[PDB]
Amino acid sequence: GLTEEQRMMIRELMDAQMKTFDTTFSHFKNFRLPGQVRKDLCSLKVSLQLRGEDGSVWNYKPPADSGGKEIFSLLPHMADMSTYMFKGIISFAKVISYFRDLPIEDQISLLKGAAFELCQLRFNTVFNAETGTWECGRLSYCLEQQLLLEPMLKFHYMLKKLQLHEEEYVLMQAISLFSPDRPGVLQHRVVDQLQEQFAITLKSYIECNRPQPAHRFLFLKIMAMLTELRSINAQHTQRLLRIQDIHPFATPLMQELFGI
């Protein structure tokens, strides 16, 4: 069985999840809309849909470029989504006692490392693998011959396949958040025992709640998924810095987290 402090751990995570993750995106408003290395971007093409309160529907089909400049038509908006996401992610971290109790300099450092990952983890819960779309309340972002060649895309598909519970998602969010090996983490021992206790909790939760043979090695699959995601996080920083080189798009908060 799952021990007392393990039940205690999950419950504080599930709580911070519900307090800070607006699953319907009700409060995403005031966002901008569309008025050489770029295989980076073209693999990530999406169409956008806004359902009005009243029943109206607005749709955006992006331009298939051969030229150069129209690939950016959607970055202002994406930069607005990301800011709104990162704010929820920060609120999530600060509502966790394990996190509050680290030194401030460590708070900042853990966040700057995992913000993207926690965010991609949340988007996975609103992803629909049948239709290749992220359903964000009134927004939908729909992927423009099955190409899991883009690591980020293969990540969402593979992870959705595992059909995790909300508790498994929030714990994954914890392991990723409390990673001992992120630039400028002073308290590497604490953050390391903390991560291990989250991992152990995940391991037990699975042993206890998923007894069926399809859920063999799930804990290990999840753990590999998280390793994959760290790799994708680093590749994405490099892509993003390249976009900044040629055009500033990053909101203040994105500059704060990506280190500029």
Ligand X SMILES: CC(C)[C@@H](NC(=O)CC(C)(C)O)C(=O)N1CC[C@](O)(c2ccc(Cl)cc2)C(C)(C)C1
Residue 55: CB minimum distance to ligand X, A? 23
Distances (CA, A) of 97 to 11, 65, 92, 93, 108: 12, 48, 11, 9, 15
Burial environment of residue 21 by CB neighbours within 10 A (0 to 12, 13 to 18, 19 or more): buried
Among 14, 18, 46, 90, binds ligand X (CB under 6 A): 46
Q: Does 75 bind ligand X (CB under 6 A)?
A: yes
Residues written for the chain? 260
13 annotated as ligand-binding: no
Residue 36: CB minimum distance to ligand X, A? 16
Among 78, 95, 158, 190, binds ligand X (CB under 6 A): 78
7 annotated as ligand-binding: no
The beta-strand segments (E) located in the chain are: 46-51, 57-60, 127-128, 133-136, 139-143
Q: Does 140 bind ligand X (CB under 6 A)?
A: no
Q: Does 141 bind ligand X (CB under 6 A)?
A: yes
Residue 169: CB minimum distance to ligand X, A? 16
Q: Quote the CA–CA distance of 172 and 25 in Å, as a whole number.
A: 22
Among 50, 108, 152, 190, binds ligand X (CB under 6 A): 152
Residue with tokens 């169409």: 47
Q: Which is nearer to ligand X, 95 or 240 (CB)?
A: 240
Residue 139: CB minimum distance to ligand X, A? 8
Q: What is the DSSP annotation of 68-85?
A: SSGGGTTHHHHHHHHHHH
Annotated binding-site ranges: 82, 120-123, 236
